[PDB]
Ligand binder design. Structure first.
Ligand code: HEM
Ligand SMILES: CC1(C)[C@@H]2CC[C@@]1(C)C(=O)C2
Ligand SMILES: [C-]#N
Ligand SMILES: [K+]
Length: 405
């Protein structure tokens, strides 16, 4: 399904890339997107897939676009256009200066101060989940750890019942990697339908959970509205149930296939934090964008008001121009460059919580299960979208090679 080429788009810039089903997906999602960085591909191309839109292929352009919110607005951040138009989460769908006031409040429920407060619970849950799997000698990492670890921590922070995970998780997945049963707009409404009654309930009987803090919060000295609160909590649910969950699987998949890298972290534990950064670069997984506020000449390309442009956060770090031998994983990499957590005024506010969950996972898993690998004959399949992920990751190991402690 290719949309008719717009009149202002030259044919030499056409590259029909499908962000929801890249043709080289079987080789790994990151490898599939990297095709946009081959020698014969321009720095900015137009794809006729998913309604038609621009795609910045190099970190230089991606960073520049994210810094220039006057021309590249977050008002319509998702492709396809229907999704981007329906997208109204706060503060991701806002541009400065109005965005800032809301970002401050959001930082209050996911900022570093909140991570320090969860420090104990994060550490405890990781050890508990891993210790329970250790004696089994096998696991389906995606649903046995990757999901429950980050999600239970989020559900506790938001004061929501763990039994609501299945439903909420399904909805958020439809917003980033839709299966076709629900449009972005339908998933958003379902999400709001779930939150509306909860927000009102907590505005009446204020609690200490993230939702209560947002619902009874203030934005630059004035009371937040129920509508605004709803839009903020919606974003929280999505950011709490998708990114970290998927990134942990890309990292564990890599460790399972690389006995040498596991040994390195076992013999030199002080490199874990640095390894986390190298993995964040190599297995970057987000790709959203912006909409043009007006006609604008960008790097020799004529963009028209209303045009959508995908600015893959994932591609900056894979750009050979930013990191030599980009597909190569080296924990000793001197200057690790990437935009995995975004760039510009929307720079991820939960990155401190994400790094903590990643580092804790690396340490506590290798400490107990230093030896493991992909299940016999298993073929790990990835899925592409606004947030890419791993469909399943069956792992196996010899229980006698593990250490309970
Ligand atoms: C490894 C996982 C993570 C990655 C790769 C990631 C990535 C991103 C990126 C690329 C953006 C900016 C998107 C844009 O410019 O439109 C973003 C925004 C944001 N992230 Fe994360 N994130 C991660 C984890 C988290 C977690 C755990 C939380 C908190 C529960 C969180 C909360 C947020 C919030 C609130 C924003 C919006 C800030 C704003 O729009 O001003 N993120 N994230
Ligand atoms: C593209 C994103 C990672 C960013 C934070 C969560 C996400 C899925 C959004 O809807 C905005
Ligand atoms: C952030 N997700
Ligand atoms: K919108």
């Amino acid at each position: 399904n290719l949309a008719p080429l717009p009149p202002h788009v030259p044919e030499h810039l056409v590259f029909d890339f499908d962000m929801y089903n890249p043709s080289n997906l079987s080789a790994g999602v990151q490898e599939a997107w990297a095709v946009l960085q081959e020698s014969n591909v321009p720095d900015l191309v137009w794809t006729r897939c998913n309604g038609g839109h621009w795609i910045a292929t190099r970190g230089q352009l991606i960073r520049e676009a994210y810094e220039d919110y006057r021309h590249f607005s977050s008002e319509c951040p998702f492709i396809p256009r229907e999704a981007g138009e329906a997208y109204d989460f706060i503060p991701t769908s806002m541009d400065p200066p109005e965005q800032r006031q809301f970002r401050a409040l959001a930082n209050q429920v996911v900022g570093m101060p909140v991570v320090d407060k969860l420090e104990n619970r994060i550490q405890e849950l990781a050890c508990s989940l891993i210790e329970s799997l250790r004696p089994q000698g096998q696991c389906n990492f995606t649903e046995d750890y990757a999901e429950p670890f980050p999600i239970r921590i989020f559900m506790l922070l938001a004061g929501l019942p763990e039994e609501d995970i299945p439903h909420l998780k399904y909805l958020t997945d439809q917003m980033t990697r839709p299966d076709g049963s629900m449009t972005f707009a339908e998933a958003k409404e379902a999400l709001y339908d779930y939150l509306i009654p909860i927000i009102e309930q907590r505005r009446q009987k204020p609690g200490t959970d993230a939702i209560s803090i947002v619902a009874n919060g203030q934005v630059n000295g004035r009371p937040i509205t129920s509508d605004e609160a709803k839009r903020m909590c919606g974003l929280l649910l999505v950011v709490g149930l998708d990114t970290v969950v998927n990134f942990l699987s890309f990292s564990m998949e890599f460790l399972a296939k690389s006995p040498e890298h596991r040994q390195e972290l076992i013999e030199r534990p002080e490199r874990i934090p640095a390894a986390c950064e190298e993995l964040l670069r190599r297995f970057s997984l987000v790709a959203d964008g912006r909409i043009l506020t007006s006609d604008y000449e960008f790097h020799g390309v004529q963009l028209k008001k209303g045009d959508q442009i995908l600015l893959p956060q994932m591609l900056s770090g894979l750009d050979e121009r930013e990191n030599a031998c980009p597909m190569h994983v080296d924990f000793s990499r001197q200057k690790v460059s990437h935009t995995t957590f975004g760039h510009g005024s929307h720079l991820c506010l939960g990155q401190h919580l994400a790094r903590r969950e990643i580092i804790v996972t690396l340490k506590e898993w290798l400490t107990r299960i230093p030896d493991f690998s992909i299940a016999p004959g298993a073929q790990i399949q990835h899925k592409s979208g606004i947030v890419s992920g791993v469909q399943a990751l069956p792992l196996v190991w010899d229980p006698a090679t593990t250490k309970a402690v």
